[PDB]
Design a protein around this ligand. Structure first.
Ligand SMILES: CNCc1ccc(N2CCC(CCC(=O)N3CCCC3)CC2)cc1
Ligand SMILES: CNCc1ccc(N2CCC(CCC(=O)N3CCCC3)CC2)cc1
Lengths: 193, 193
């Protein structure tokens, strides 16, 4: 039962590494999963719904890893605390580049993809703002910008910068320099006066 | 001659305010410009080429305004110098929201749109890095990150943040707060140690 669904998902992820969703057919997905085209339609109504499920898995993987980090006590080294959190996103999405690339392109055409991304960005921005607020409460960070607005711009920067680096876009920060670049901007803007 | 081309462009910009490019037909563009469908094809091969020309005009408008600012002497107030430059982009793209929205969505499907955006982002990032380098040379800014990498991430942040604010995306920084938010992040990351 679930083995066929997982085979369809694993096939779509493998094919997305070599070509976009528009160049992948239902025949290609069914062939790779070792099933017929009508058996595919039992599990998914379209190749677009396969992508949505793949993105949902990657997004929940990053969210669960962040929750594991958030539940444990806070790092006493301010810079390190932010670097470890940004690293969760760099590693999770960076381990699924083809899904990340396809998922971002789908946001323009799919209401479901746009809604899924929006829900998780709101969660991640709210947590970021809560940590900035805690840093301000303990006197470690100055009260400069509204914390939720600052958190919004820094999360949007990471989204655009990490995904440009993974895709090797021109322009982009080299993947081997992107974590240090983002951490510097987060620490200086959060603690800087 | 040029009046018909300008009428097609003005019609496309007006129609993009109410619906996406996919929902606008060549008949709609020809009707608004007061021409026939075959006369339209004399000026443009597709509605996609009309969008490309609109984006080219907005991008050159922002670049020319930045060049006017760059040619004049530098502002003695460090924060203000960066705010005036970011404001060129906020005002130029913010005065053409429908073209900005459509142009960004087209980057995923059009090689020509992606190439045009890439060329101008490289120019704007290189100028940004040159100003950071001048600030470091005069001892006003510390030598922290490689200037070109820092410039890349800050320009990508502005692209994503300004365009999310203009589109009223969830999440986004309110349009009335986006300039102060970006300037704070630019100044703290450029001058901060
Ligand atoms: C106090 N607890 C430790 C702790 C502190 C900070 C965090 N962070 C939350 C995540 C945040 C990064 C978000 C990001 O890079 N993206 C890319 C695409 C969309 C969001 C960076 C800091 C996590 C745990
Ligand atoms: C010393 N001369 C005065 C001077 C100093 C700085 C500037 N800047 C160049 C532009 C830069 C902003 C770029 C930006 O917001 N975007 C949005 C979409 C793509 C690029 C901000 C600072 C301009 C003139």
């Amino acid at each position: 039962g679930d083995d066929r669904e997982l085979a369809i998902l694993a096939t779509a992820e493998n094919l997305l590494e070599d070509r976009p969703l528009a160049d992948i057919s239902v025949d290609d997905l069914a062939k790779g999963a070792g099933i017929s085209r009508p058996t595919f339609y039992f599990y998914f109504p379209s190749k677009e719904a396969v992508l949505l499920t793949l993105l949902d898995r990657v997004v929940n993987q990053a969210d669960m890893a962040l929750q594991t980090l958030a539940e444990n006590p806070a790092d006493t080294d301010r810079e390190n605390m932010w670097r470890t959190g940004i690293n969760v996103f760099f590693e999770t999405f960076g381990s699924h580049k083809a899904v990340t690339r396809a998922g971002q392109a789908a946001r323009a055409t799919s209401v479901e993809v746009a809604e899924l991304w929006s829900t998780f960005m709101q969660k991640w921005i709210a947590y970021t703002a809560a940590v900035i607020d805690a840093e301000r409460d303990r006197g470690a960070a100055p009260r400069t910008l509204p914390a939720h607005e600052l958190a919004t711009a820094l999360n949007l920067m990471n989204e655009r910068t990490l995904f440009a680096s993974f895709a090797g876009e021109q322009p982009s920060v080299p993947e081997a320099r992107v974590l240090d670049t983002l951490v510097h901007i987060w620490v200086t803007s959060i603690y800087g006066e």
